[PDB]
Write a protein that binds this DNA or RNA. Structure first.
Lengths: 53, 53
RNA sequence: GGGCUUCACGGAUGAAGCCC
RNA sequence: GGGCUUCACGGAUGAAGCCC
């Protein structure tokens, strides 16, 4: 795993076409921004496992 | 972009081979954990352009 | 503008509630 | 466990400083 400590308002990248922005804190929550083309998928842990239903 | 608001300790998934956990928050910063195979790249925005120089 | 919480298979720098 | 800040091309559940 590649752990990083990104400042709010900045971003991270993956592959050559993906970006993972950090919009900021939300208390015990955090608002992240996953940016990828529709060529790939993006879901949360409590919803990916909800598909097998 | 697909914005979401996760809690600390939860996670996100991408490309069916990548997992993006939220390890926690640190004031103006956040700690994320990019889990991807070494078959693909992952770099921060402030150093993706550092490679180009 | 700030703090906390909740909703959201949602592709949008998402949404709603409480307090100052 | 909680609050603030700084250093990290680093694939590691990264690092350092101040306070309870």
């Amino acid at each position: 795993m590649l752990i990083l400590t990104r400042k709010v308002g900045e971003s991270i990248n993956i592959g050559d076409d993906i970006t993972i922005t950090i919009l900021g804190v939300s208390g015990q929550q955090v608002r992240i921004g996953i940016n990828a083309p529709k060529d790939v998928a993006v879901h949360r842990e409590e919803i990916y496992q909800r598909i097998q239903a």
